[PDB]
Swiss-Prot record:
Protein name: Glutaminyl-peptide cyclotransferase-like protein
Topology of the protein relative to the lipid bilayer: Single-pass type I membrane protein
Statement: the UniProt record of this protein carries the keyword Transport: no
Presence of the UniProt keyword Cell cycle in the record: no
Class of the enzyme per the UniProt entry, highest EC level: transferase
Lineage: Eukaryota, Metazoa, Chordata, Craniata, Vertebrata
Family of the protein in this entry: Belongs to the glutaminyl-peptide cyclotransferase family.
Role description: Responsible for the biosynthesis of pyroglutamyl peptides.
Positions that bind Zn(2+): D115, E155, H280
Top-level taxon of the source organism: Eukaryota
GO cellular component, as recorded: Golgi apparatus; Golgi membrane; membrane
Amino acid sequence: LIGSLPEARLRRVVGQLDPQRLWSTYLRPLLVVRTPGSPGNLQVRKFLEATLRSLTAGWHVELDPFTASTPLGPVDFGNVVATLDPRAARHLTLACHYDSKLFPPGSTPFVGATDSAVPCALLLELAQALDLELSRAKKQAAPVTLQLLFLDGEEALKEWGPKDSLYGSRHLAQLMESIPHSPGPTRIQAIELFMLLDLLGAPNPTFYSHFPRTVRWFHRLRSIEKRLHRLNLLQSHPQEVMYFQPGEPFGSVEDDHIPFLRRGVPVLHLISTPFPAVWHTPADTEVNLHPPTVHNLCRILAVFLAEYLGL
Ligand SMILES: [Zn+2]
């Protein structure tokens, strides 16, 4: 299709992905209890920061720390914000949440492998696999850069009503609205597209377009799935289209995009609906992930990113 990578550039891009790196260097370290305010959450925050700072492209990496009221009293939250080129007029923003949902004491510990350790790991792997190309685009002052958001506090702490959720995204969207950007006028308007990854890594996911505004990008993802299938680049993928489905959504849900959506940001919500079978149970673990699906999604996203940013 027009603006698609030539086959030769596509196979090179896919070949820069390293499945073992994704799994062991980016995913495995996240698979700990990481509820807001916990030591594990702080350790994951520092791991994300250090990993992002290590990329040779030289990202601007900053924390958005704050304290908020919760059903458990005041709790500290910290969003990790990585912007490749902070001088660029606008950016594609890819987002996910790095907290894990708090369960009661004496429960089987919940580590949220699909929700959202896999999303987090995918963003890290994409940034690393495309690091040389991203570095060159920044050095050329490309007018659209890349931003990665690792949001804290997406999950409710006690399922205690509508304000016990989305702590990090609500705070960050309000913060961005207060910060000037050129041309902006604020950092909210710098977001050209907000792509939220959530509930990824289970077998047999299904994705629908939730926002007519951004359906062209949903169609691009679907076309990339079909193309990779026909190129013999997907595993355990017997039908041409499995993940990106046509039609009205099975259902739409509140998530970290909402504070951005409400401020006019265009959103693509890349979330499995129906949710994974393991959703919000302690069986949402590494062993219940489907590795071929994880790597297939990584490949689809890598091609999407290279096409979107002209890498
Ligand atoms: Zn969840």
